[PDB]
Amino acid sequence: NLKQFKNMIQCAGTRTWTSYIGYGCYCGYGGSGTPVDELDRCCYTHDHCYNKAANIPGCNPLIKTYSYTCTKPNITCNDTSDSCARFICDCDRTAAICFASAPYNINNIMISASTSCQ
């Protein structure tokens, strides 16, 4: 679920979830336009991943509790049988690692209302 995604974020990276709350055109709730950079691209993919999760029976991306472990900075998704669980854990793990590896452009914090996200 979301609380797990937040912990995965700090597991895999140096920045916590709050630094992404309002980044670019896609980090944080919804969004539109072209993802401004790699990081934004990360959030763009994650949004879609969550959308697809809904296409799975009894699967809610924000409340679904999955199984995972953190051996800082390593994240491991343990689910195999529970498809919904494995799918969402993958979404989050992917995003968490993506966030960690991508550069954070302070120039792109707060642009969702600018030409950039049109």
Q: Footprint of a second copy on this chain (CB under 8 A)?
A: 21-22, 25, 28-32, 47, 50-51, 54-63, 110, 112-113, 117
Extract the tokens encoding 34: 């072209």
Decide if 46 is catalytic.
yes
Closest to 112 (Cα-Cα) out of 40, 51, 62: 40
Decide if 48 is catalytic.
no
Position 71 contacts Cl ion (CB under 5 A): no
Partner whose footprint covers residue 80, from a second copy, Cl ion, none (CB < 5 to 8 Å by kind): Cl ion
> In the bound complex, what is the minimum distance in angstroms from residue 10's beta carbon to a second copy?
18
CA angle 100, 87, 102 (to 5 degrees): 15
Q: How far is CA 36 from the centre of its chain?
A: 16
Position 69 contacts Cl ion (CB under 5 A): no
Q: Which residues bind Cl ion (CB under 5 A)?
A: 80-81
